[PDB]
Design an enzyme around this catalytic site. Structure first.
Site, short mmCIF file in Angstrom:
data_model
loop_
_atom_site.label_atom_id
_atom_site.label_comp_id
_atom_site.label_asym_id
_atom_site.label_seq_id
_atom_site.Cartn_x
_atom_site.Cartn_y
_atom_site.Cartn_z
N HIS B 192 0.81 -1.21 0.00
CA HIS B 192 0.00 0.00 0.00
C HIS B 192 0.85 1.26 0.00
N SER B 196 0.17 -1.31 -6.94
CA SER B 196 0.42 -2.49 -7.75
C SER B 196 1.54 -2.21 -8.74
N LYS B 218 -14.87 -7.70 -10.73
CA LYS B 218 -13.90 -8.53 -11.42
C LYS B 218 -13.39 -9.63 -10.51
N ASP B 219 -13.09 -9.28 -9.26
CA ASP B 219 -12.68 -10.30 -8.31
C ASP B 219 -13.80 -11.28 -8.05
N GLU B 262 1.32 -35.78 -2.17
CA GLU B 262 0.35 -35.15 -3.04
C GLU B 262 1.06 -34.44 -4.19
C1 HEM Z 1 -3.76 -23.65 3.76
C2 HEM Z 1 -4.33 -24.32 4.77
C3 HEM Z 1 -4.55 -25.85 4.79
C4 HEM Z 1 -4.13 -26.82 3.96
C5 HEM Z 1 -3.22 -26.63 2.73
C6 HEM Z 1 -4.68 -28.09 4.43
C7 HEM Z 1 -4.49 -29.33 3.87
C8 HEM Z 1 -5.33 -30.40 4.04
C9 HEM Z 1 -5.48 -31.49 3.12
C10 HEM Z 1 -4.71 -31.61 1.79
C11 HEM Z 1 -6.37 -32.35 3.59
C12 HEM Z 1 -6.75 -33.62 2.81
C13 HEM Z 1 -7.40 -34.71 3.63
C14 HEM Z 1 -8.32 -35.46 2.71
O1 HEM Z 1 -8.55 -34.97 1.58
O2 HEM Z 1 -8.82 -36.54 3.11
C15 HEM Z 1 -6.85 -31.83 4.86
C16 HEM Z 1 -7.77 -32.36 5.74
C17 HEM Z 1 -8.10 -31.81 6.96
N1 HEM Z 1 -7.99 -30.48 7.29
FE1 HEM Z 1 -6.50 -29.45 6.62
N2 HEM Z 1 -5.46 -27.87 5.53
C18 HEM Z 1 -5.41 -26.50 5.73
C19 HEM Z 1 -6.02 -25.88 6.74
C20 HEM Z 1 -6.87 -26.50 7.58
C21 HEM Z 1 -7.79 -25.75 8.37
C22 HEM Z 1 -7.82 -24.21 8.29
C23 HEM Z 1 -8.49 -26.61 9.09
C24 HEM Z 1 -9.61 -26.28 10.09
C25 HEM Z 1 -10.14 -25.06 10.21
C26 HEM Z 1 -8.02 -27.95 8.75
C27 HEM Z 1 -8.47 -29.13 9.27
C28 HEM Z 1 -8.42 -30.32 8.59
C29 HEM Z 1 -8.81 -31.62 9.09
C30 HEM Z 1 -9.35 -31.91 10.51
C31 HEM Z 1 -8.62 -32.50 8.12
C32 HEM Z 1 -8.91 -34.01 8.20
C33 HEM Z 1 -10.00 -34.29 7.18
C34 HEM Z 1 -9.46 -35.19 6.11
O3 HEM Z 1 -8.34 -35.73 6.27
O4 HEM Z 1 -10.16 -35.36 5.08
N3 HEM Z 1 -7.02 -27.84 7.82
N4 HEM Z 1 -6.17 -30.65 5.10
C1 HEM Z 2 -2.30 -16.64 1.34
C2 HEM Z 2 -1.30 -16.19 0.58
C3 HEM Z 2 -1.36 -14.85 -0.18
C4 HEM Z 2 -2.28 -13.88 -0.17
C5 HEM Z 2 -3.57 -13.80 0.67
C6 HEM Z 2 -1.84 -12.87 -1.10
C7 HEM Z 2 -2.48 -11.70 -1.39
C8 HEM Z 2 -2.08 -10.81 -2.35
C9 HEM Z 2 -2.91 -9.80 -2.94
C10 HEM Z 2 -4.38 -9.53 -2.61
C11 HEM Z 2 -2.18 -9.12 -3.81
C12 HEM Z 2 -2.68 -7.96 -4.67
C13 HEM Z 2 -3.17 -8.56 -5.98
C14 HEM Z 2 -2.05 -8.51 -6.97
O1 HEM Z 2 -1.13 -7.68 -6.76
O2 HEM Z 2 -2.06 -9.29 -7.96
C15 HEM Z 2 -0.86 -9.69 -3.82
C16 HEM Z 2 0.17 -9.24 -4.60
C17 HEM Z 2 1.42 -9.79 -4.64
N1 HEM Z 2 1.70 -11.03 -4.07
FE1 HEM Z 2 0.36 -12.36 -3.01
N2 HEM Z 2 -0.66 -13.27 -1.67
C18 HEM Z 2 -0.35 -14.48 -1.12
C19 HEM Z 2 0.75 -15.22 -1.42
C20 HEM Z 2 1.82 -14.75 -2.12
C21 HEM Z 2 2.98 -15.52 -2.46
C22 HEM Z 2 3.24 -17.00 -2.10
C23 HEM Z 2 3.80 -14.76 -3.13
C24 HEM Z 2 5.15 -15.30 -3.65
C25 HEM Z 2 6.10 -14.52 -4.16
C26 HEM Z 2 3.20 -13.45 -3.26
C27 HEM Z 2 3.73 -12.37 -3.90
C28 HEM Z 2 3.04 -11.26 -4.29
C29 HEM Z 2 3.60 -10.14 -4.99
C30 HEM Z 2 5.06 -9.98 -5.43
C31 HEM Z 2 2.64 -9.25 -5.21
C32 HEM Z 2 2.93 -7.92 -5.95
C33 HEM Z 2 1.71 -7.14 -6.41
C34 HEM Z 2 1.98 -6.46 -7.72
O3 HEM Z 2 2.97 -6.84 -8.40
O4 HEM Z 2 1.21 -5.54 -8.09
N3 HEM Z 2 1.97 -13.48 -2.63
N4 HEM Z 2 -0.82 -10.72 -2.90
C1 LIG Z 3 -4.50 -4.31 -6.94
C2 LIG Z 3 -5.21 -4.90 -5.73
N1 LIG Z 3 -4.96 -4.43 -4.53
C3 LIG Z 3 -5.55 -4.91 -3.47
C4 LIG Z 3 -5.22 -4.33 -2.10
O1 LIG Z 3 -4.32 -3.27 -2.30
C5 LIG Z 3 -6.47 -5.95 -3.57
C6 LIG Z 3 -7.14 -6.46 -2.31
C7 LIG Z 3 -8.42 -6.05 -2.03
C8 LIG Z 3 -9.06 -6.48 -0.89
C9 LIG Z 3 -8.43 -7.35 -0.02
O2 LIG Z 3 -9.14 -7.72 1.13
C10 LIG Z 3 -9.30 -9.07 1.44
C11 LIG Z 3 -10.50 -9.70 1.14
C12 LIG Z 3 -10.69 -11.03 1.47
C13 LIG Z 3 -9.68 -11.72 2.12
C14 LIG Z 3 -8.49 -11.09 2.44
O3 LIG Z 3 -7.47 -11.79 3.09
C15 LIG Z 3 -7.40 -11.60 4.47
F1 LIG Z 3 -8.53 -10.98 4.92
F2 LIG Z 3 -6.31 -10.84 4.76
F3 LIG Z 3 -7.29 -12.82 5.07
C16 LIG Z 3 -8.30 -9.76 2.11
C17 LIG Z 3 -7.14 -7.76 -0.28
C18 LIG Z 3 -6.50 -7.32 -1.43
C19 LIG Z 3 -6.77 -6.47 -4.81
O4 LIG Z 3 -7.69 -7.50 -4.96
C20 LIG Z 3 -6.12 -5.92 -5.91
CL1 LIG Z 3 -6.45 -6.55 -7.54
#
Ligand code: HEM
Ligand code: HEM
Ligand SMILES: Cc1nc(CO)c(-c2ccc(Oc3cccc(OC(F)(F)F)c3)cc2)c(O)c1Cl
Ligand code: HEC
Lengths: 57, 370, 239, 32, 65, 98, 74
Positions: B192, B196, B218-219, B262
């Site tokens: 911010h 972007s 759009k989002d 996986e």
């Molecule tokens: C980025 C975040 C997370 C990833 C990448 C992830 C990954 C996974 C994956 C790949 C499975 C596959 C199990 C299946 O398909 O049978 C799973 C199951 C599960 N997830 Fe996670 N998880 C995430 C976050 C969470 C969250 C936020 C919760 C609860 C709020 C959670 C609770 C569980 C539990 C209890 C299972 C067992 C159910 C199952 O094995 O099918 N996980 N998770």
């Molecule tokens: C849960 C994970 C993430 C969330 C919630 C998130 C969220 C965001 C959002 C909302 C934007 C603005 C949209 C955009 O710029 O296209 C952004 C931009 C960006 N994100 Fe992610 N992001 C995540 C993971 C990552 C990861 C893994 C990378 C790895 C490099 C990354 C790198 C960037 C960069 C470099 C930008 C630059 C924005 C621009 O170039 O204008 N973010 N991220």
């Molecule tokens: C250019 C550009 N910029 C911004 C913010 O500067 C955004 C943008 C707008 C709103 C956002 O708010 C959110 C909405 C839902 C979940 C979210 O995650 C959270 F809340 F942090 F876990 C953020 C987050 C990012 C965007 O979508 C684009 Cl395209």
């Protein structure tokens, strides 16, 4: 006037009405869309579902 | 009054030349909330004990009113997560966003957070790949000298995976997405201060516009396609990505013939599998990820983008192939036809990044006299 | 040495809106009882899951009254047997895996709850497994108890041939041939590893006719707003 | 100058109801 | 009482890919059986016969059932 | 032979298909922000409009017709005098510090 | 940061229209599809050939894998 313009000035103009319209249409829409898919799903799986074998037993 | 912070999300200046790529940057905000939302209700019935866990999954898939969905909206949802990343991460390479040095490094720590989270998320239900998938990945840290056996035993709560090692994850796993939920806000904060980064690479300050009408919908449109391409999996093919073995209960006295975690590790798992040595392949793995932090010290062209660098385009999409190769080559067993490819492809990965992408701008600067 | 890929057989449910012939689930359940349930410990199911799918309340409840179940601490401080009820899962054949290995040639029947989704190909495998017993080829020798079947990995299995033509007889009286058995059973097993197939397709269908209908309208509402800037001419008018 | 300015013609883009500059709005507006 | 399957396998063993692989199988069959000490077998050729067979069984068999 | 390649690359980069020039697309840093601050009005606004339309056409993914494209012989290097002036001062500012 | 002190503009004019006064999807088929092609011709050459080669190494990688399991004449 078309239907559209007659539709606008009655409903889609006053926001209080515009929200009243949507729940109404949705409330009836729930009553049709279910009947549709449930029948199409019934139709495509004719001779397979429980209700089709519900009289024998 | 704190609503005024949502100047960030309402009245924000942003460009007008914007693709649908950057929707992917926003969907994670939905995927992160969507996954937690599902997973929470999901975890009202899970059990962190061995004897009941796999049953405690089937307690959902069978008996719960529409509980069977929530497993798959969650699981395959966790895969649509990555599909946005590896389009979102490859983006800034192809549009030069890594220059925001304060931000790209955050883009790492989110990833490593997930790739140690999602791992924990696969092992909870004891699918006979859970266990060995936990064993294969976790055992590698034993490669370290003088601490490897100590840490891995320390995280194995003993000497191998067991009831304790389950429960040490279900709490480490049900927590971190919040740590991602927070750090994500940081990931936006440093943005911010600059906004972007257009596809061209140019400061489009002259042509910045609002955000509430335009990129919002759009989002949503971006979100709508996501749910679509997430409902299809759960509704029509949930068995697709997740290996079938994960429905088998786990038994340490019987391995499957073929093992793979996986699908999404496989670009990285294969890299280790190529190296016959144990340790020297590991440090390639961690470097296969942390290299992204090493890129901004390798931005050669005094341009930014790759829209205006046709040579680097030829090398960029080339990297996508090598990944799509290493995504698959790891997914297949260890035999002579493929090992010859991993020794090449894994080297190509390091090679394209650290030699040739700089080399392009070193040239392209010179083709145009600077 | 090689694997074997089963083919892509047709089914009454292979389509993206094709449900299960619940009739075919009916006779398949008879097969699990007369044949399989002497050695296959299906634990993750109960008779109450059969209601509204293949049997009724009374007809299924009759089958729990059939078999006895271990239940209850007596006030004397003991345990006894009673006729099963609906809430009880399938009577397990053997108390543990080991006795199943001892009651066989050291090998263990896997459960059939989720075997279909836990084995590459599922139905096509399982169908072509039973219907792929053949005389061994040249040069192959096999120990006692084992038998030959190519689809199983290693081509060496401890599987006694369980099916044969008119091994039993069904209720409505269909031809109890080795194939028609193998359909209704494989049709059954998919339901075991998917009690949601019928409803999966319903929301499987309801989705599109919303999203296919919405997704343009949104795609208009997008283009409704952006059209200010999809249509914009600029200029440069200095002195 | 500010009189030499002129607006182009979006008739390639407009709705059909309004292409006729001789007519008025407000009879199709309620429909639009 | 007859299995409908065997009727179909019978019709299919007349087909092109089925017959040709059957011929190679017999040549494998004699090549091994005429040899004395061989860690060799016709598990190789048998499979190319079957996947060629079952592809025909596939296309139609549930017209009857 | 070389110069047949510079003229070709400059046609393949795309940024003649958007009414732009070469200095337009440069990565902006502190060294460059100095120069763009130092430009005169007549040329500075002329930088703005070249950008302001290329963006709106990278929005649509449209371009200009072939006539309005940019030509390699006309790729004016208007920024180079103002830039190299800077980095002269930079290295004078660094080596004087050592 | 916000609108008001970003940067300078001088002597530029903007012409923009309501949406209501115009169709949403004008010339969607007419002008778009030629623009899809021109969009496509400018990317296809430096996008496919890696993925083309992948189809061959997904090809030769399986064929050469299949042979190795088939016995040798010995
Ligand atoms: C980025 C975040 C997370 C990833 C990448 C992830 C990954 C996974 C994956 C790949 C499975 C596959 C199990 C299946 O398909 O049978 C799973 C199951 C599960 N997830 Fe996670 N998880 C995430 C976050 C969470 C969250 C936020 C919760 C609860 C709020 C959670 C609770 C569980 C539990 C209890 C299972 C067992 C159910 C199952 O094995 O099918 N996980 N998770
Ligand atoms: C849960 C994970 C993430 C969330 C919630 C998130 C969220 C965001 C959002 C909302 C934007 C603005 C949209 C955009 O710029 O296209 C952004 C931009 C960006 N994100 Fe992610 N992001 C995540 C993971 C990552 C990861 C893994 C990378 C790895 C490099 C990354 C790198 C960037 C960069 C470099 C930008 C630059 C924005 C621009 O170039 O204008 N973010 N991220
Ligand atoms: C250019 C550009 N910029 C911004 C913010 O500067 C955004 C943008 C707008 C709103 C956002 O708010 C959110 C909405 C839902 C979940 C979210 O995650 C959270 F809340 F942090 F876990 C953020 C987050 C990012 C965007 O979508 C684009 Cl395209
Ligand atoms: C003789 C007791 C018994 C009978 C009766 C029986 N099973 Fe088996 N089943 C076993 C045993 C023992 C195995 C062990 C196979 C192995 O170890 O590979 C097995 C294996 C299986 C498997 C595992 C396939 C695999 O890849 O290992 C399936 C599926 C199966 N049986 C289905 C059936 C079906 C269908 C029937 C009825 C047509 C049936 N069983 C009847 C005992 C039995």
């Amino acid at each position: 006037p078309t239907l559209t313009a007659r539709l606008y000035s009655l409903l889609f103009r006053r926001t209080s009405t515009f929200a009243l319209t949507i729940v109404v249409g949705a409330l009836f829409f729930e009553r049709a869309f279910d009947q549709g898919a449930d029948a199409i799903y019934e139709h495509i799986n004719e001779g397979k579902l429980w209700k089709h074998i519900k009289h024998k037993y | 009054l704190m609503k005024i912070v949502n100047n960030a999300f309402i009245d924000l200046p942003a460009p007008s030349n914007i693709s649908s790529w950057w929707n992917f940057g926003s969907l994670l905000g939905i995927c992160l909330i969507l996954q937690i939302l599902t997973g929470l209700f999901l975890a009202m019935h899970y059990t962190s004990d061995t004897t009941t866990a796999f049953s405690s999954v089937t307690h959902i898939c069978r008996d719960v009113n529409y509980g069977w969905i929530i497993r798959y909206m969650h699981a395959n949802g966790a895969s649509m997560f990555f599909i946005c990343l590896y389009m979102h991460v490859g983006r800034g390479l192809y549009y030069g966003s890594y220059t925001f040095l304060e931000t790209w490094n955050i883009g790492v720590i989110l990833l490593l957070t997930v790739m140690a989270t999602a791992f924990m998320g696969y092992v909870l239900p004891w699918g006979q790949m859970s266990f060995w998938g936990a064993t294969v990945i976790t055992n590698l840290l034993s490669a370290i000298p003088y601490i490897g056996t100590n840490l891995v035993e320390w995280i194995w709560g003993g000497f191998s995976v067991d009831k304790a090692t389950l429960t040490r994850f279900f709490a480490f796993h049900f927590i971190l997405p919040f740590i991602i939920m927070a750090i994500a806000m940081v990931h936006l904060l440093f943005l911010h201060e600059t906004g972007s980064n257009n596809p061209t690479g140019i400061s489009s300050d002259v042509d910045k516009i609002p955000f509430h009408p335009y990129y919002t919908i759009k989002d949503i449109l971006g979100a709508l396609l996501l749910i679509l391409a997430l409902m299809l999996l759960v509704l029509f093919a949930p068995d697709l990505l997740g290996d079938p073995d994960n429905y088998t209960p786990a038994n340490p006295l019987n391995t499957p013939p073929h093992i793979k975690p996986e699908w999404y590790f496989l670009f990285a798992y294969a890299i280790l599998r190529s190296i016959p040595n144990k340790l020297g392949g590991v440090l390639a793995l961690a470097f296969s990820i942390l290299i992204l932090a090493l890129i901004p010290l390798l931005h050669t062209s005094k341009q930014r983008s790759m829209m205006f660098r046709p040579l680097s385009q030829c090398l960029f999409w080339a990297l996508v192939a090598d990944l799509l190769t290493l995504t698959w080559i790891g997914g297949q067993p260890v035999e002579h036809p493929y090992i010859t490819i991993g020794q090449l492809a894994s080297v190509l990965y390091f090679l394209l990044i650290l030699v040739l992408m700089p080399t392009a701008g070193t040239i392209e600067n010179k083709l145009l006299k600077w | 040495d090689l694997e074997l890929h089963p083919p892509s057989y047709p089914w009454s449910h292979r389509g993206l809106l094709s449900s299960l012939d619940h009739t075919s689930i009916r006779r398949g359940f008879q097969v699990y009882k007369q044949v399989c349930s002497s050695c296959h410990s299906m634990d993750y199911v109960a008779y109450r899951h059969l209601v509204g799918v293949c049997y009724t309340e009374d007809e299924a409840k009759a089958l729990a009254e059939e078999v006895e179940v271990q239940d209850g601490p007596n006030e004397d401080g003991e345990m006894f047997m009673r006729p099963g009820k609906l809430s009880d899962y399938f009577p397990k054949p053997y108390p543990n895996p080991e006795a199943a290995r001892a009651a066989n040639n050291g090998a263990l029947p896997p459960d059939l709850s989720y075997i279909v989704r836990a084995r590459h190909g599922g139905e096509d495998y399982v169908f072509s497994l039973l219907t792929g017993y053949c005389e061994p080829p040249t040069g192959v020798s096999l120990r006692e108890g084992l038998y030959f079947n190519p689809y199983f990995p290693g081509q060496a299995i401890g599987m006694a041939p369980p099916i044969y033509n008119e091994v039993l007889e069904f209720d409505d009286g269909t031809p109890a041939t080795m194939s028609q058995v193998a359909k209704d059973v494989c049709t059954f097993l998919r339901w075991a590893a998917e009690p949601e197939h019928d409803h999966r397709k319903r929301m499987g269908l309801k989705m599109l006719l919303m999203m296919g209908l919405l997704l343009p309208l949104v795609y208009a509402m997008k283009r409704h707003k952006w059209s200010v800037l999809k249509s914009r001419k600029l200029a440069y008018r200095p002195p | 100058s500010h009189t030499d300015i002129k607006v182009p013609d979006f008739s390639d883009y407009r709705r059909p109801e309004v292409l006729d500059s001789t007519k008025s709005s407000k009879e199709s507006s309620e429909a639009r | 009482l007859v299995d409908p399957l065997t009727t179909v396998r019978e019709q299919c063993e007349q087909l092109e890919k089925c017959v040709k692989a059957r011929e190679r199988l017999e040549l494998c069959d004699e090549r091994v059986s005429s040899r004395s000490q061989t860690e060799e077998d016709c598990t190789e050729e048998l499979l190319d016969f079957l996947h060629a067979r079952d592809h025909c069984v596939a296309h139609k068999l549930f017209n009857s059932l | 032979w070389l110069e047949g390649i510079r003229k070709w690359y400059y046609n393949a980069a795309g940024f003649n298909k958007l009414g732009l020039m070469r200095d337009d697309t440069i990565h902006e840093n502190d060294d460059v922000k100095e120069a763009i601050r130092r430009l005169p009005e007549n040329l500075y606004d002329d930088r703005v409009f070249r950008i302001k339309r290329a963006l709106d056409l990278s929005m649509r993914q449209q371009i200009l017709p072939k006539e309005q494209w940019t030509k390699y012989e006309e790729d004016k290097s208007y920024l180079e005098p103002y830039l190299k002036e800077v980095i002269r001062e930079r290295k004078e500012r660094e080596e004087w510090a050592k | 940061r916000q609108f008001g002190h970003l940067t300078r503009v001088r002597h530029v004019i903007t012409y923009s229209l309501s949406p209501f006064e115009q169709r949403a999807f004008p010339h969607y088929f007419s002008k778009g599809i030629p623009n899809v092609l021109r969009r496509t011709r400018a990317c296809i050459l430096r996008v496919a050939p890696p993925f083309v080669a992948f189809y061959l190494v997904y090809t030769w990688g399986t064929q050469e894998f299949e042979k190795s399991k088939r016995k040798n004449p010995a």
